Design a protein around this ligand. Structure first.
Ligand SMILES: Nc1nc2c(ncn2[C@@H]2O[C@H](COP(=O)(O)OP(=O)(O)OP(=O)(O)O)[C@@H](O)[C@H]2O)c(=O)[nH]1
Ligand SMILES: Nc1nc2c(ncn2[C@@H]2O[C@H](COP(=O)(O)OP(=O)(O)OP(=O)(O)O)[C@@H](O)[C@H]2O)c(=O)[nH]1
Ligand SMILES: [Mg+2]
Lengths: 417, 427
């Protein structure tokens, strides 16, 4: 039942802190852990992410670089987390996957696994873990993958959800990241049950083209990521019937294992139902940078939040499924699931969230693929890994697996009844 | 004497059972605490303190809905050891309910039925409530069927299954679980009363004028039909006296044990000023395709058996007149070698509804159990969806990773394919 949150690296810690702050505001729990909301619905399923002793988050915070302690401790929710749960190293990884996966992750991984064990043994029944981390750095990616592998071999029967951000030149323009991204996507394909592939390029595009901004810093990007995380976990946090827990969600949304990469979408961006329904499918509202009309969705989960008529939303969802029936595969009957919740997110009245397993995600990996092709064929920075207990064979096999994943998505896009 | 046991599996089964037992108590005048201020003793066992308790087993692999029962106004009506929960469910997976999760709980469940039965002397069988789209409601229902047949082979068994419908559907793998549970259960059951959620949804939208019928309305209506079916067992009727007489009158062959159930009439509570519908009008409404629990066309199929169950202030002569009027029609087509009559059992207890629901009390009503070949198409749609998935091997890994072999799906499909043939064989 309970979910053991995990976050690694700077990006993972930041997005996780935003997630916790937003859901705490939604659930009425103050910054000291006590409840001060005014609804019965808030406490119906509060044990999923919180512990009562005042409410304490069920989180473990990991970062090799030790400064991010104070930053995390300086946020609006810095004292609620269990002080033992902070598991921080001494030296940063320097954006190297092998540094965070073989030479320095291998030392702190034991302590973080022990903290995970201590957090898990305190739950009567456990659904699984959610890892908010980053695929571009050397601390979030390598350590995240190492912990995922260790937990999966230690808890073979737990659903390992994760949240991953694929880097873009428009945000950092650093050149070593795609190696880390490829090596991390290898483990994500092999050792994960579902994944919400967030793209920094997509967030930059939404911030610039739509929000009419110069799009600086990480504040707005993490704000959008927090909103999407709240939207996607709305079903698990509050009482309902669609995707009541992580395993039901994975059964509903993921056919064909190793093909479990999801395109999120949120609206509005910072108002009647029909424009919500039209926008949530639109290309201008995807946190994974692509055109959803360039591919065919395999499964879709649409979650509405606020006060709205059920007949109207049912009619409009039926209309959208009818109009765009070209893009919905005909060999998965009733592949669009719809949920409606009463509680709107903080500051928003009417909100819509979309999670779609679609073949369009393939072009994302292709993008990353080409970036890898831009460096691996040039032997760029190869010894940075070979000197750290890494071999070129892992690079080649990761490239091969990502290309095979692209081929799988294309094949299921082209297939017909 | 004559005793029956009620078994409820999964969320849908448990909620239908809530509604059915609530209506039973309201009909028999049993207080929610169980103290009654007996032909109905078949469904209630009395203790030394005069406390009448249902012979109901509420089973679930997750505790949410069972806890809903334990915190409801009928908390003291059921015995705490008659309600069984668990810490892990099947997550919409027949394989998990049947193979993985069901092993740890089936022994305890069967022990609970054993204790319930040791207080019984004249058991006819069990009335199992479950559904088709659920992992629990298919897997554990199937395992319980098999183990009860091994344990109570002489005894009879019935289902009250729920046909999945897209509007209220929760999972995409509903046809998978439906085919699997049907294939495994077809041998161990005597009569299945399938109910389509789309039919109930449409009735609530049209007759009851409910804009968005939630599960409460569906379970209330389903409780009405189930109670009308079981009244003969509970009101000491002249027909369908025991569970064996159901299958004797309605299931003339082993495989084809799927009757079509019709209930008339349905009047919204806000239409309380309704004039009383005559026997002829409700008799005609019985055969109208807009008032059937499973969507099909009896006009386009050939009957096999049929029976009426009336209720209320109903006079036998008018019943005979309506039967004569219906019989001289070309729309009713029995087979050319079977009794071409209607086994008409008539009851006189007035129809009574839940005080507070959207249904209004009607002084007389009627139910219609017709085993025909129409319901065949109701099966085919399911197979169609199945044929759309297994061809691509969609979602099969979830089943194969929890102790199920892949080819079993094909076998299951083949089974219902064979089932379909039988429908054209008799037609
Ligand atoms: N949108 C967004 N992206 C971030 C944020 N923090 C880091 N990133 C991304 O992460 C990339 C940098 O690598 P990280 O994955 O953050 O590595 P780290 O977490 O700092 O840990 P190290 O690998 O040791 O440096 C950059 O390209 C950013 O795009 C954030 O708060 N919001
Ligand atoms: N009549 C009726 N049907 C329901 C109700 N709730 C759910 N259903 C139907 O049952 C189907 C799912 O089967 P369930 O028995 O609820 O599944 P489950 O018991 O939770 O089994 P698991 O998912 O493995 O835990 C849904 O598709 C609904 O169509 C209800 O309250 N009344
Ligand atoms: Mg359930």
């Amino acid at each position: 039942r309970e979910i053991v949150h995990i976050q690694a690296g700077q990006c993972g810690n930041q997005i996780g802190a935003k997630f916790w702050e937003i859901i705490s505001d939604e659930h009425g729990i103050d910054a000291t852990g006590a409840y001060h909301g005014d609804s019965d619905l808030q406490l119906e399923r509060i044990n999923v992410y919180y512990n009562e002793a005042k409410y304490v988050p069920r989180a473990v915070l990991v970062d090799l670089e030790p400064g991010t302690m104070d930053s995390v401790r300086s946020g609006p929710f810095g004292q609620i987390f269990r002080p033992d749960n902070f598991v921080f190293g001494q030296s940063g990884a320097g954006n190297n996957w092998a540094k965070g996966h073989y030479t320095e992750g291998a030392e702190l991984v034991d302590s973080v696994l022990d903290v995970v064990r201590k957090e898990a043994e305190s739950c009567d029944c456990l659904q699984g873990f959610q890892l908010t981390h980053s695929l571009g750095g050397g601390t979030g990616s390598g350590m995240g993958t190492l912990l995922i592998s260790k937990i999966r071999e230690e808890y073979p029967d737990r659903i390992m959800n994760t949240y991953s951000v694929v880097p873009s030149p428009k945000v950092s323009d650093t050149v070593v990241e795609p190696y880390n991204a490829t090596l991390s996507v290898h483990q994500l394909v092999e050792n994960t049950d579902e994944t919400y592939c967030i793209d920094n390029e997509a967030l930059y595009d939404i911030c610039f083209r739509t929000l009419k901004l110069t799009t600086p810093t990480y504040g707005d990007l993490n704000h959008l990521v927090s909103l999407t995380m709240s939207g996607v976990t709305t079903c698990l946090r509050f009482p309902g019937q669609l995707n009541a827990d992580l395993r039901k969600l994975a059964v509903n949304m993921v056919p064909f294992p190793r093909l479990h990469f999801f395109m999120p979408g949120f609206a509005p961006l910072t108002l009647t139902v029909p424009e919500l329904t039209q926008q949530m499918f639109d290309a201008k509202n995807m946190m994974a940078a692509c055109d959803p009309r360039h591919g065919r969705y395999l499964t879709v989960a649409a979650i509405f939040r606020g006060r709205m008529s059920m007949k109207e939303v049912d009619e409009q969802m039926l209309n959208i499924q009818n109009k765009n029936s070209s893009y919905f595969v005909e060999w998965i009957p009733n592949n669009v699931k719809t949920a409606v919740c009463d509680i709107p997110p903080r500051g928003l009245k009417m909100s819509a969230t979309f999670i779609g397993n679609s073949t369009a995600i393939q072009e994302l990996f292709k993008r990353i693929s080409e970036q890898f092709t831009a460096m691996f064929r040039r032997k760029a920075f190869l010894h940075w890994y070979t000197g750290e207990g890494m071999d070129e064979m892992e690079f080649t096999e990761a490239e091969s697996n990502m290309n095979d994943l692209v081929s799988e998505y294309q094949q299921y896009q082209e297939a017909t009844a | 004497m004559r005793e029956c046991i009620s078994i409820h599996v999964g969320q849908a089964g448990v909620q239908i059972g809530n509604a059915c037992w609530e209506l039973y108590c309201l009909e028999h005048g049993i207080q929610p605490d169980g103290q009654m201020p007996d032909s109905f003793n078949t469904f209630f066992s009395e203790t030394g303190a005069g406390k009448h308790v249902p012979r109901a087993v509420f089973v679930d692999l997750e505790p949410t809905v069972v806890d809903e029962v334990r915190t409801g106004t009928y908390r003291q009506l059921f015995h705490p050891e008659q309600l069984i929960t668990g810490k892990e469910d099947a997550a919409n997976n027949y394989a998990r309910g049947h193979y993985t999760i069901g092993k740890e709980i089936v022994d305890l469940v069967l022990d609970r039925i054993r204790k319930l039965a040791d207080q019984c002397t004249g058991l006819q069988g069990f009335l199992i409530f479950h559904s088709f789209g659920g992992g629990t409601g298919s897997g554990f229902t199937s395992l319980l069927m098999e183990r009860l047949s091994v344990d109570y082979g002489k005894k009879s068994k019935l289902e009250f299954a729920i046909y999945p419908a897209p509007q209220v559907s929760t999972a995409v793998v509903e046809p998978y679980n439906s085919i699997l549970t049907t294939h495994t259960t077809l041998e161990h059951s005597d009569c299945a009363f399938m109910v389509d959620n789309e039919a109930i949804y449409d009735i609530c939208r049209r007759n009851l004028d409910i804009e968005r019928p939630t599960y409460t309305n569906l379970n209330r209506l389903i409780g009405q039909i189930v109670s009308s079916i079981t009244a003969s067992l509970r009101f000491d009727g002249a027909l369908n006296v025991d569970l064996t007489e159901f299958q004797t009158n309605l299931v003339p062959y082993p495989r084809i044990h799927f009757p079509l159930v019709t209930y008339a009439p349905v009047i919204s509570a806000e239409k309380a000023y309704h004039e009383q519908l005559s026997v002829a009008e409700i008799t005609n409404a019985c055969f109208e395709p807009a008032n059937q629990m499973v969507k099909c066309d009896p006009r386009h199929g050939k009957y096999m058996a049929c029976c009426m169950l009336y209720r209320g202030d109903v006079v036998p002569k008018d019943v005979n007149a309506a039967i004569a009027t219906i019989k001289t029609k070309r729309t009713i087509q029995f087979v050319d070698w079977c009794p071409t009559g209607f086994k008409v059992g008539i009851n006189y207890q007035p129809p009574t509804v839940v005080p507070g629901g959207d249904l209004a009390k009607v002084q007389r009503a009627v139910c219609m159990l017709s085993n025909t070949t129409a319901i065949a198409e109701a099966w085919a749609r399911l197979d169609h969806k199945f044929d759309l998935m297994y061809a691509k091997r969609a979602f099969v890994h979830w089943y194969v990773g929890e102790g199920m072999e892949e080819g079993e799906f094909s076998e299951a499909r083949e089974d219902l394919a064979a089932l379909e043939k039988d429908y054209e064989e008799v037609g």
